[PDB]
Design a protein around this nucleic acid. Structure first.
Lengths: 105, 62, 71, 86, 115
RNA sequence: CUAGAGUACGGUAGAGGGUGGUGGAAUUUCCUGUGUAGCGGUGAAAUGCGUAGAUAUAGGAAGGAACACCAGUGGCGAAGGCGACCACCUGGACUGAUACUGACACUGAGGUGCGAAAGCGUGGGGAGCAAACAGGAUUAGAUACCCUGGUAGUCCACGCCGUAAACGAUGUCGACUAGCCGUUGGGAUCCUUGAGAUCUUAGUGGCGCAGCUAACGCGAUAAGUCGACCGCCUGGGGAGU
């Protein structure tokens, strides 16, 4: 429960990422997991080279699903070429919205 | 990294910035492998040389 | 007393669960080369120094902070 | 073991008390927890540091039975047969 | 042939010092070593011999121009900083000086300790 | 009967285990460009590697193991041991409030387990390091130290062996006995701004009075004053044979 999936996509797929949001989160709603934030940090420059690119498109997302929808997005990120890194987390708490992109501008 | 303005200034800004970063004593400890007991002697002798230094200075702080 | 106030950079505020998101905080605790500072220089309490080292290693993984001056 | 799985057992083998101290409460909680772990130790075989915790609970269970037998017999066999031990 | 704004690479071991003048493309123009200046022994490892080989690389570099240099210093040995002072002695605008140093985070294990 | 002991309830801290996954720096082998005479090594040299284009230098690919800085008289574990990040299962300890059980405890011959490293069996895997070994040097002599190479092994799965300066050279458990300076984690009280204050438990360090000790030295983490159970010692070799 209460995961904090953060994943970044390819800079050439940042146009297509709007359909990529609901394509993943609709399957979570099939499991029975509500989503408490969905932030899109945008196109930024990395600190180093990840498969010889330098821009990305960060996607922040906090999901509270059961053990099956976690098995979904664990596999779908591995079977993609848009997404280049991911990080699944776990907190034992709830989620408020609008963390830092106000302050990051 | 040191950019540049006379030249003698940027030397001493580079000899010092390398040492204040490090990577000169660490290279010198890559040329012989210490078994982890001998790395527990550095952890033992340096802890004595710090707690005894906090007390020997108090004699100067009398 | 600069090493004294930075202990209160986390304990005077209710910012106990630090995140790997506030890069404006984490750049105060990283040296010019990239390596992480000790805790007798900042003087932070060792509860938070352990908690500070995780948020570096996660932000380093997401390419938000470099490792060395090479890349 | 979960929280409500503890509350399911205390409601069942209560001695009309509302109280969690009696041996029929304590023996019941341990026996439900030994049976849960037996499939943890069929996947994890080389988990030795967690094998050590299970033998604490087994030896604790044979000490409360002899305290129970060392007081009464009627309370004893009404608990052995209701869990299927020995 | 004409190139400008080259890069000077300095490799400094405990027994020898190798200096190479290149371009941004990483192509050899002029290399010069401490052993080629005729020292060959205990005199080879001195920081004086890292000035003789430094200027001698800086004389076959004026075949192509190269009025601007970018210095990468690499190695633990002596003559690590004496070679830089023997670069603009030949009259080269040194822009920036940069440490490059191979430091393994864990790495392979090194050889055993001498006795 | 509730002071030992155990349960139920909040709450923190951790390189405590096991099963997968993913990183970045560096080393080596290989490919390709530029470029041309040495590189490497040492008290000093030599064996070695080089125009059949090395070292250097830039681009690319493959693969293996270890996990800088944080890191500390710092933590956790019954002991051996345990440091990349995340998920996954999973053991115990601390701290507070509160109810319950009402002595349910301690130790333990025999017996049962977990046992560093080197080694052994079948199968994988082969980056570096490196016994055996080979060559050079030193040397009256040099099997040795030092130098250039280099195999089993170290790595993984499964099974075995059971010893170490397996060390705090100190069996486990319980109760009393002046102080002071540190430190991990946790509640307190407190004027409140604290770089706060004092007190109290659970650890982990430095000095020290009584006391003990052949002396050195330990000294609320006893070798002090006392209890309960167990193991073990009886001159040196011969011989842990």
């Amino acid at each position: 429960r209460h995961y904090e999936i953060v994943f970044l996509v390819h800079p050439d797929q940042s146009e297509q990422v709007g359909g990529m949001v609901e394509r993943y989160t609709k399957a979570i709603e099939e499991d029975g997991g509500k989503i408490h934030r969905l932030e899109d940090w945008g196109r930024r420059q990395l600190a180093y080279a990840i498969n010889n690119v330098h821009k990305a498109h960060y996607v922040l997302m906090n999901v509270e699903c059961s053990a099956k929808a976690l098995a979904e997005l664990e596999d779908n990120f591995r079977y993609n070429d848009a997404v280049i890194r991911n990080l699944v987390m776990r907190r034992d708490e709830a989620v408020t919205e609008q963390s830092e992109m106000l302050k990051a501008e | 990294k040191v950019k540049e303005e006379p030249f003698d200034v940027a030397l001493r800004r580079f000899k010092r910035s390398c040492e204040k970063a490090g990577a000169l004593a660490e290279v010198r400890s890559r040329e012989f492998y210490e078994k982890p007991t001998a790395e527990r002697k550095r952890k033992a002798a340096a802890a004595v040389k710090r707690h005894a230094k906090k007390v020997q200075r108090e004699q100067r702080r009398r | 007393f600069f090493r004294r106030r930075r202990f209160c950079r986390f304990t005077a505020e209710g910012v106990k669960e630090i995140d790997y998101k506030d890069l404006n905080t984490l750049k105060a605790y990283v040296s010019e080369t990239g390596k992480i500072v000790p805790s007798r220089i900042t003087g932070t309490k060792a509860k938070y120094q352990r908690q500070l080292a995780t948020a570096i290693k996660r932000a380093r993984y997401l390419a938000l902070l470099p490792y060395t001056d090479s890349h | 073991l979960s929280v409500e799985e503890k509350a399911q057992i205390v409601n069942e083998y209560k001695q009309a008390e509302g109280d969690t101290g009696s041996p029929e409460v304590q023996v019941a909680l341990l026996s439900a927890n030994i049976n849960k772990l037996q499939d943890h130790f069929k996947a994890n075989g080389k988990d030795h540091h967690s094998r050590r915790g299970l033998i604490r609970m087994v030896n604790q269970r044979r000490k409360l039975l002899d305290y129970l037998k060392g007081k009464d017999v009627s309370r004893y066999t009404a608990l052995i047969g209701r869990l299927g031990l020995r | 042939k004409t190139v400008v704004d080259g890069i000077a690479h300095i490799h400094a071991s405990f027994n020898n010092t190798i200096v190479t003048i290149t371009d941004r493309q990483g192509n050899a123009l002029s290399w010069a070593t401490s052993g080629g200046s005729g020292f060959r022994g205990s005199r080879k490892s001195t920081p004086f011999a890292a000035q003789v080989a430094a200027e001698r690389a800086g004389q076959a570099a004026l075949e192509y121009g190269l009025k601007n240099l970018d210095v990468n210093v690499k190695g633990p040995g002596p003559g690590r900083e004496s070679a830089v002072r023997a670069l603009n002695a030949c009259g080269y605008k040194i822009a920036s000086i940069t440490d490059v140093t191979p430091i393994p985070h864990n790495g392979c294990r090194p050889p055993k300790k001498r006795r």
